[PDB]
Design an enzyme around this catalytic site. Structure first.
Site, PDB file in Angstrom:
ATOM      1  N   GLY A   9       0.830  -1.194   0.000  1.00  0.00           N
ATOM      2  CA  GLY A   9       0.000   0.000   0.000  1.00  0.00           C
ATOM      3  C   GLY A   9       0.864   1.242   0.000  1.00  0.00           C
ATOM      4  O   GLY A   9       1.931   1.235   0.602  1.00  0.00           O
ATOM      5  N   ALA A  11       0.913   3.869   1.673  1.00  0.00           N
ATOM      6  CA  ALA A  11       1.336   4.128   3.041  1.00  0.00           C
ATOM      7  C   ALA A  11       2.416   3.160   3.502  1.00  0.00           C
ATOM      8  O   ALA A  11       3.521   3.571   3.836  1.00  0.00           O
ATOM      9  CB  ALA A  11       0.158   4.058   3.952  1.00  0.00           C
ATOM     10  N   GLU A  44      -0.858   1.389  -7.648  1.00  0.00           N
ATOM     11  CA  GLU A  44      -0.787   2.768  -8.132  1.00  0.00           C
ATOM     12  C   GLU A  44       0.702   2.971  -8.335  1.00  0.00           C
ATOM     13  O   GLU A  44       1.466   3.094  -7.379  1.00  0.00           O
ATOM     14  CB  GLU A  44      -1.304   3.774  -7.105  1.00  0.00           C
ATOM     15  N   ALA A  72      -5.578   1.615  -8.153  1.00  0.00           N
ATOM     16  CA  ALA A  72      -5.528   1.316  -6.733  1.00  0.00           C
ATOM     17  C   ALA A  72      -6.918   0.983  -6.170  1.00  0.00           C
ATOM     18  O   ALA A  72      -7.179  -0.153  -5.757  1.00  0.00           O
ATOM     19  CB  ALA A  72      -4.938   2.496  -6.005  1.00  0.00           C
ATOM     20  N   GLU A 156     -13.041   3.635   4.707  1.00  0.00           N
ATOM     21  CA  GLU A 156     -12.072   3.110   5.679  1.00  0.00           C
ATOM     22  C   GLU A 156     -12.503   1.853   6.439  1.00  0.00           C
ATOM     23  O   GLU A 156     -11.871   0.819   6.299  1.00  0.00           O
ATOM     24  CB  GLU A 156     -11.693   4.218   6.664  1.00  0.00           C
ATOM     25  N   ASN A 179      -2.268   6.243  13.456  1.00  0.00           N
ATOM     26  CA  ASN A 179      -1.853   7.485  12.815  1.00  0.00           C
ATOM     27  C   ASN A 179      -2.169   8.745  13.619  1.00  0.00           C
ATOM     28  O   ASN A 179      -1.289   9.575  13.818  1.00  0.00           O
ATOM     29  CB  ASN A 179      -2.472   7.583  11.429  1.00  0.00           C
ATOM     30  N   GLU A 227      10.227 -15.261  19.604  1.00  0.00           N
ATOM     31  CA  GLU A 227      10.120 -14.780  20.981  1.00  0.00           C
ATOM     32  C   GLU A 227       8.859 -13.959  21.169  1.00  0.00           C
ATOM     33  O   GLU A 227       8.053 -14.228  22.057  1.00  0.00           O
ATOM     34  CB  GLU A 227      11.318 -13.909  21.342  1.00  0.00           C
TER      35      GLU A 227
HETATM   36  N1  LIG Z   1       2.287   6.762   9.508  1.00  0.00           N
HETATM   37  C1  LIG Z   1       1.950   6.901   8.258  1.00  0.00           C
HETATM   38  N2  LIG Z   1       0.687   6.722   7.874  1.00  0.00           N
HETATM   39  C2  LIG Z   1       0.499   6.905   6.526  1.00  0.00           C
HETATM   40  C3  LIG Z   1       1.461   7.259   5.573  1.00  0.00           C
HETATM   41  N3  LIG Z   1       0.901   7.360   4.321  1.00  0.00           N
HETATM   42  C4  LIG Z   1      -0.361   7.088   4.508  1.00  0.00           C
HETATM   43  N4  LIG Z   1      -0.673   6.797   5.814  1.00  0.00           N
HETATM   44  C5  LIG Z   1      -2.000   6.446   6.353  1.00  0.00           C
HETATM   45  O1  LIG Z   1      -2.440   5.245   5.704  1.00  0.00           O
HETATM   46  C6  LIG Z   1      -3.754   5.455   5.124  1.00  0.00           C
HETATM   47  C7  LIG Z   1      -3.637   5.797   3.674  1.00  0.00           C
HETATM   48  O2  LIG Z   1      -3.611   4.705   2.775  1.00  0.00           O
HETATM   49  P1  LIG Z   1      -3.492   5.173   1.201  1.00  0.00           P
HETATM   50  O3  LIG Z   1      -2.256   5.948   0.974  1.00  0.00           O
HETATM   51  O4  LIG Z   1      -4.767   5.868   0.867  1.00  0.00           O
HETATM   52  O5  LIG Z   1      -3.477   3.849   0.442  1.00  0.00           O
HETATM   53  P2  LIG Z   1      -2.498   2.685   0.286  1.00  0.00           P
HETATM   54  O6  LIG Z   1      -2.780   1.824   1.505  1.00  0.00           O
HETATM   55  O7  LIG Z   1      -1.130   3.118   0.040  1.00  0.00           O
HETATM   56  O8  LIG Z   1      -3.076   1.825  -0.996  1.00  0.00           O
HETATM   57  P3  LIG Z   1      -4.151   2.367  -2.137  1.00  0.00           P
HETATM   58  O9  LIG Z   1      -5.504   2.690  -1.517  1.00  0.00           O
HETATM   59  O10 LIG Z   1      -4.477   1.324  -3.216  1.00  0.00           O
HETATM   60  O11 LIG Z   1      -3.466   3.595  -2.704  1.00  0.00           O
HETATM   61  C8  LIG Z   1      -4.340   6.645   5.850  1.00  0.00           C
HETATM   62  O12 LIG Z   1      -4.992   6.215   7.023  1.00  0.00           O
HETATM   63  C9  LIG Z   1      -3.105   7.489   6.120  1.00  0.00           C
HETATM   64  O13 LIG Z   1      -3.331   8.308   7.269  1.00  0.00           O
HETATM   65  C10 LIG Z   1       2.775   7.453   5.994  1.00  0.00           C
HETATM   66  O14 LIG Z   1       3.733   7.752   5.287  1.00  0.00           O
HETATM   67  N5  LIG Z   1       2.955   7.248   7.380  1.00  0.00           N
HETATM   68 MG   LIG Z   2      -1.121   4.271  -2.908  1.00  0.00          MG
END
Ligand SMILES: Nc1nc2c(ncn2[C@@H]2O[C@H](COP(=O)(O)OP(=O)(O)OP(=O)(O)O)[C@@H](O)[C@H]2O)c(=O)[nH]1
Ligand SMILES: [Mg+2]
Ligand SMILES: CC(=O)O[C@H]1C(=O)[C@@]2(C)[C@H]([C@H](OC(=O)c3ccccc3)[C@]3(O)C[C@H](OC(=O)[C@H](O)[C@@H](NC(=O)c4ccccc4)c4ccccc4)C(C)=C1C3(C)C)[C@]1(OC(C)=O)CO[C@@H]1C[C@@H]2O
Ligand SMILES: Nc1ncnc2c1ncn2[C@@H]1O[C@H](COP(=O)(O)OP(=O)(O)NP(=O)(O)O)[C@@H](O)[C@H]1O
Ligand SMILES: Nc1nc2c(ncn2[C@@H]2O[C@H](COP(=O)(O)OP(=O)(O)O)[C@@H](O)[C@H]2O)c(=O)[nH]1
Ligand SMILES: [Mg+2]
Lengths: 412, 426, 329
Positions: A9, A11, A44, A72, A156, A179, A227
């Site tokens: 993902g 994120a 994506e 995505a 979500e 987050n 562990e």
């Molecule tokens: N800690 C942290 N949370 C993140 C980061 N990027 C995104 N998030 C969180 O993860 C979620 C976002 O997921 P998306 O970026 O929309 O999607 P993805 O899981 O990468 O996959 P797709 O939906 O197919 O793009 C949200 O709840 C954001 O707050 C990051 O760099 N760090």
């Molecule tokens: Mg993405």
């Protein structure tokens, strides 16, 4: 010995680039050194591309960077079933090609973002296909579950009640980092209303370094991945402990840095420092893995913890006499050259299973219903190879996760 | 990923010139020139709107559909007019009569095949197609009729790729045409059943927002168009840029449409301050949400304050804190719990690009799916009946091979569409 | 108690029908999972009450027809609407209940029995009534209405009646004045129904079927025309895509059709029980059967279910359909 990692993902990939950064940073391996030991999945392209365009560009093999130029879709279904499917094979191939090359591994540290499309869905079947291809290993998935009030995607919950039920019967130990509850730490324990995602990432990027990195690294009280799950999960539900870090002090503002153990350990149980909006509102701990790193005297610990064991207001489960896995490492933490992290000479990345999440799950389940109760964005999944089944039948799933996290506690 | 714009009718066309006027600069593409891009990022994702042939000639991949030569011959004889490959111009020198029926059943129906032809040449371009952008006005022939056909065909050819529709729903106060509700009711009908994302703009919601939110005293059309084109750039193209949290047509679609109707939104831009003075820079962020979420500033005619929301998508594009963004959105969701519908714990869909609008520091496109737009189709639907009842200028439709049951159909359909939308306001 | 909760009495429920296992499969792999209690509860896992009625694996075709269709046919002959919906996946017993064998003295289904009862009143009660029984047979495949008689049209449209209620115009209708001609329409429509090539035993329906019996009766003395519509809707199969692995076949295409139509289903019973008016005119199925979903409550849903490792899926969905109404007191 090793532990592969699959950052899924956008994120899980951003956090990945981060956790992956902190790494070389504390191992003296600049931009172009050795070779990672993980992979990157996303439907994506533009995001994995950021790992292909930005920093840590050549530290990866275009082979451990999987992408599906396609779409995505912030919906489980599509990412799990329909689209996400096409890529999985290929994905697996690497975690079977990278899993072979090594020498007696221990598992795959998975990095996903619960409430996403590529993060919830996909993984769901990735971890799914793993539990069968390597049932004989560790499956610790490091998740970033839905901000308690500050969610993003409109759906979500649909995506997170679905990644939980499908992964539940496949993970070993699921770490959780909230987050939002991390922002608080950036506001209250570091002071900054300018927290870029790139920061939260530096943070988990820290707590995570305390898990694998340093632990798989020699020390005075080593703690293997196995562990964890052993000393950390009382029951087969892929139980989800919470990550917490201690010296989360600001490298500019205040400076009392020299905060002997006795302090940094107490700073873990105060709810305002746990990367999770699951304030121990009642949740009785049932097992904590206090991973320390830096200059720490075992007595200091086997005392600082003793003091805690007798604070009572920290009430541990009944059926659990002692639930304190003391993990001591040598090398102190390693803060980004100039981010905003203090940089102490000792820290406490304590993670644990707390009857607390009884909440967090609850509050996230309820969400779901409200929408499902009206089908809301249901047509988006159905039309993507899912059914009234998978939803209703994954709801019932978590239901027994609200009872589970209730029974294993609150009762004697 | 990719998309293929569609300039149906004159309006939809006139706007094409503005949507491409902009977008290009937001991608450093001079008339026939190439990528002069001040940066290097305005290129890694262009494909979404162009094609590689020469090496300096990235040609917009849109379609120009119209039964009135003079129009496309004004767009092709002016500024950026000489960037479209002639193949793109699907003209209909016929009589572009102002009849929905004349551009959907009799005159347009012919020119269609010679369009679909190209819409396929462009779709089968390369890589993977995402969807098509559609501009037009629901108050004329080549717009509502012929463009509303173009989609009914598109949506049969690729019920997979998406369909964003930018409609210039008939402004209230004064109608720039007479049968308007005829050409309209008939096109909305086609919309509620083919495209799956519609952004309704109102020439007078713009004036207002352009004469009081931009002390602009002489808001020429070019302007209105320009403002609109500003929003459609924030939507698409934008998200095809990096971001801490990026989305793309689908996310936008899969987070904004609770129920299959397709539902129509109402776009709103962020920094909308008058030139000199106003250049207050109060754009820390609370200032953008302040903006976007107010009544005025909604390109739509109706006012949000007149009906809950189902979904919202603040597609920001300029370096900001995922905290001061994710946060603000909340208070906003609580100060106005009243109107924001409840059966959706988090209506808002926060999106966050990185690079902002070329010359600006921080912006944020707003795509609202509020139940308020009920009070517009009502309007339209009313105008119909009041005149349908007497079959007003109906002979211009029937006499063109239409049906007395066709008009009935649309009204009802689109009329029911009003109904449903209320099912959530409650 | 429990009676007051019957607020759903909307009758528009969905009677459960379990098919029995044959000797060849009792010891192959398929075994009982359906525990019956009384004549109205079915215990599958955790489940303390079911709903209105469960027909056991001992209930006749005739018995299912009496409870489910006999009243609906009676009301249709007085000029009312009625709907009978059918559902159940592969090997659940759908083919056996709706038609059975075309001429079997007690193994015949619903459609051959209605046809027999219709022509037993005709010529015994026609002396001022002039009957015309018109049958129309169409499928919804890729959400397009494909006529199954004459020349197959890959799409067909709705238009609106005198009240602004839609109906399928252009649907090829034909007169039937004895039972044989009804069978000939069924044979013709089934021979072009989209069926997945499995093994000969399995019949994997990928296209939803609507069989229209339009009972037109004309009165000779000044009183006018009646037109009762009996919609017999044979839903196509539902298959769990997760298990089977649709890579690319008419599995993906069917998954989108069956899910869109079952979802609209959910809202329609919920509205038929208690809601404000909503998703009418959304899909062609809904456009074909709307007048019935608002008035003469006669939309009997007959869901099948056969014990085993399979059928549990579609049976489960059939029970989830009308399970909520008044809760409570
Ligand atoms: N800690 C942290 N949370 C993140 C980061 N990027 C995104 N998030 C969180 O993860 C979620 C976002 O997921 P998306 O970026 O929309 O999607 P993805 O899981 O990468 O996959 P797709 O939906 O197919 O793009 C949200 O709840 C954001 O707050 C990051 O760099 N760090
Ligand atoms: Mg993405
Ligand atoms: C010196 C300086 O900073 O000038 C600004 C400026 O003064 C202001 C007033 C601009 C100005 O915009 C208008 O006056 C305007 C005219 C007709 C219709 C609508 C708006 C500006 O013309 C617009 C221009 O916008 C851009 O450059 C964006 O990239 C924008 N581009 C276009 O709309 C465009 C215009 C002409 C040719 C090609 C593209 C954009 C926005 C969203 C998505 C893609 C592109 C900007 C910042 C300015 C000027 C130049 C004065 C503002 O508008 C925008 C869209 O940014 C109006 O309120 C904002 C606030 C800006 O500060
Ligand atoms: N009551 C019954 N008595 C005898 N045979 C039966 C009975 N019910 C079903 N069968 C048989 O069992 C199989 C299931 O038939 P049908 O063919 O009725 O299934 P479905 O229609 O349940 N299948 P599918 O359409 O693939 O989803 C057929 O071989 C039937 O002849
Ligand atoms: N914003 C906007 N509206 C336009 C433009 N041109 C015509 N319109 C609107 O479109 C309607 C008239 O339809 P028109 O475009 O002439 O139809 P067609 O050319 O026969 O397809 C009126 O409501 C106008 O206000 C334009 O360039 N910008
Ligand atoms: Mg069958």
């Amino acid at each position: 010995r090793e532990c592969i990692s699959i950052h899924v993902g956008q994120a899980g990939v951003q956090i990945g680039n981060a956790c992956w950064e902190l790494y070389c940073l504390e191992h003296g391996i600049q931009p172009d050194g050795h070779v990672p030991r993980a992979v990157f999945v996303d439907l994506e392209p533009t995001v994995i591309d950021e790992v292909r365009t930005g920093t840590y560009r050549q530290l990866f093999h275009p082979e451990q960077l999987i992408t599906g130029k396609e779409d995505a879709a912030n919906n489980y279904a599509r990412g799990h079933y329909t689209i996400g499917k096409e890529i999985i094979d290929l994905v697996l191939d690497r975690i079977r090609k990278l899993a072979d090359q090594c020498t007696g591994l221990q598992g795959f540290s998975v990095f996903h973002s619960f409430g996403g499309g590529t993060g919830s869905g996909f993984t769901s079947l990735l971890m799914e296909r793993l539990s069968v291809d390597y049932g004989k290993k560790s499956k610790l998935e490091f998740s970033i579950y839905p901000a308690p009030q500050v969610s993003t995607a409109v759906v979500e919950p649909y995506n997170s009640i679905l990644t939980t039920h499908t992964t539940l019967e496949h993970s070993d130990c699921a770490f959780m980092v909230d987050n939002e509850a991390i922002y608080d730490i950036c506001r209250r324990n570091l002071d900054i209303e300018r927290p870029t995602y790139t920061n939260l990432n530096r943070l988990i990027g820290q707590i995570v370094s305390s898990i694998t990195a340093s632990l798989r690294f020699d020390g005075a009280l080593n703690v293997d991945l196995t562990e964890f799950q052993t000393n950390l999960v009382p029951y087969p539900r892929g139980h989800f402990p919470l990550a917490t870090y201690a010296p989360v002090i600001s490298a500019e503002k205040a400076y009392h840095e020299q905060l002997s153990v006795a302090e940094i350990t107490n700073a873990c149980f105060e709810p305002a420092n746990q990367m999770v909006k699951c304030d121990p509102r009642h949740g009785k701990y049932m097992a904590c893995c206090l991973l320390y790193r830096g200059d720490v005297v075992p007595k200091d610990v086997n005392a600082a913890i003793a003091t805690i064991k007798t604070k009572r207001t920290i009430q541990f489960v009944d059926w659990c006499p002692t639930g304190f896995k003391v993990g001591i490492n040598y090398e102190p933490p390693t803060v980004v050259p100039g981010g905003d992290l203090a940089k102490v000479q000792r820290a406490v990345c304590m993670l644990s299973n707390t009857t607390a999440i009884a909440e967090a799950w609850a509050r996230l389940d309820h969400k779901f219903d409200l929408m499902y109760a009206k089908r809301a964005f249901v047509h988006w999944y159905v039309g993507e190879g899912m059914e009234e089944g998978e939803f209703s039948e994954a709801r019932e799933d978590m239901a027994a996760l609200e009872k589970d996290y209730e029974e294993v506690g609150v009762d004697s | 990923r990719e998309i293929v714009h569609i300039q149906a009718g004159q309006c939809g066309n006139q706007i094409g010139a503005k949507f491409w006027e902009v977008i290009s600069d937001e991608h450093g593409i001079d008339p026939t020139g190439s990528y002069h891009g001040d940066s290097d990022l305005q290129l890694e994702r262009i494909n979404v709107y162009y094609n590689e042939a020469a090496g300096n000639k990235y040609v917009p991949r849109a379609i120009l559909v119209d039964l009135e030569p003079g129009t496309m011959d004004s767009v092709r004889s002016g500024p950026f007019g000489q960037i479209f490959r002639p193949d793109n111009f699907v003209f209909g020198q016929s009589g572009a009569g102002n009849n929905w029926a004349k551009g959907h059943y009799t005159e347009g129906a012919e020119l269609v095949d010679s369009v679909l032809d190209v819409v396929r040449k462009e779709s089968e371009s390369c890589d993977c197609l995402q969807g098509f952008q559609l501009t037009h006005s629901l108050g004329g022939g080549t717009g509502s009729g012929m463009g509303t056909l173009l989609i009914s065909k598109i949506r049969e050819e690729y019920p997979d790729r998406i369909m964003n529709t930018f409609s210039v729903v008939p402004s209230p106060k004064v109608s720039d045409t007479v049968v308007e509700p005829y050409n309209a009711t008939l096109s909305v009908h086609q919309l509620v059943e083919n495209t799956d994302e519609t952004y309704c703009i109102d020439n007078e919601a713009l004036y207002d927002i352009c004469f009081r939110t931009l002390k602009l005293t002489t808001p020429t059309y070019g302007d209105l168009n320009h403002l609109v084109s500003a929003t459609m750039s924030g939507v698409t193209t934008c998200l095809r840029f990096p971001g801490q949290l990026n989305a793309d047509l689908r996310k936008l679609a899969v987070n904004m449409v609770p129920f299959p109707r397709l539902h129509f939104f109402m776009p709103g831009f962020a920094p909308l301050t008058s030139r000199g003075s106003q250049q207050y820079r109060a754009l820390t962020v609370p200032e953008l949400t302040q903006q976007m979420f107010d009544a005025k500033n909604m390109m739509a005619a109706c006012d949000p304050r007149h009906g809950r929301y189902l979904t919202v998508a603040a597609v920001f594009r300029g370096r900001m804190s995922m905290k001061e963004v994710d946060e603000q959105m909340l208070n906003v969701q609580n100060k106005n719990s009243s109107y924001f519908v409840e059966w959706i714990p988090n209506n808002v869909k926060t999106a966050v690009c990185d690079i902002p609008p070329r010359g600006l520091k921080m912006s944020a496109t707003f795509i609202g799916n509020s139940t308020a737009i009920q009070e517009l189709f009502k309007r339209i639907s009313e105008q119909f009946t009041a005149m349908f009842r007497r079959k007003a200028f109906l002979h211009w439709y029937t006499g063109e091979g239409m049906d007395e049951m066709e008009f009935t159909e649309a009204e009802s359909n689109m009329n029911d569409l009003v109904s449903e939308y209320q099912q959530y306001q409650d | 108690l429990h009676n007051t909760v019957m607020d759903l009495r909307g009758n528009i429920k969905v009677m459960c029908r379990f098919r029995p296992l044959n000797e060849a499969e009792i010891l192959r792999g398929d075994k009982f999972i359906p525990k019956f209690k009384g004549e109205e509860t079915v215990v599958i896992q955790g489940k303390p009450y079911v709903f209105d009625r469960v027909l056991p694996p001992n209930t006749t075709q005739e018995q299912v027809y009496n409870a489910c269709a006999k009243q609906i046919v009676k009301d249709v002959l007085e000029g009312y609407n009625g709907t009978i919906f059918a559902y159940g996946q592969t090997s659940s017993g759908k083919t056996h209940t709706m038609e059975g064998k075309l001429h079997d003295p007690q193994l015949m289904g619903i459609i051959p029995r209605i046809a027999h009862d219709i022509f037993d009143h005709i010529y015994s009660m026609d002396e001022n009534l002039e009957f015309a029984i018109k049958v129309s047979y169409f499928e919804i495949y890729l959400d397009k209405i494909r006529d199954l008689l004459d020349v197959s049209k890959t799409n067909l449209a709705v238009h609106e009646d005198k009240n602004r209620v839609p109906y399928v115009k252009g649907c090829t209708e034909r007169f039937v004045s004895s039972p044989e001609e009804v069978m000939d329409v069924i044979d013709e429509g089934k021979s072009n129904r989209h069926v997945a090539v499995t093994n000969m035993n399995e019949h994997s329906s990928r296209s939803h079927s609507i069989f229209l019996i339009n009972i037109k009766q004309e009165n000779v003395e000044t009183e006018k025309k009646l037109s009762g519509k009996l919609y017999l809707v044979d839903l196509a199969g539902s298959e769990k895509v997760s298990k089977t692995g649709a890579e690319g076949a008419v599995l993906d295409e069917a998954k989108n059709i069956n899910k869109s139509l079952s979802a609209l289903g959910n809202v329609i019973s919920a509205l038929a029980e208690g809601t404000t008016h909503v998703p009418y005119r959304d899909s062609k199925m809904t456009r074909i059967l709307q007048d019935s979903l608002g008035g003469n409550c006669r939309t009997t849903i007959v869901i099948c279910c056969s014990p085993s490792v399979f059928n549990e899926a579609e049976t489960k969905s059939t029970l989830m359909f009308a399970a909520s109404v008044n809760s409570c007191k």
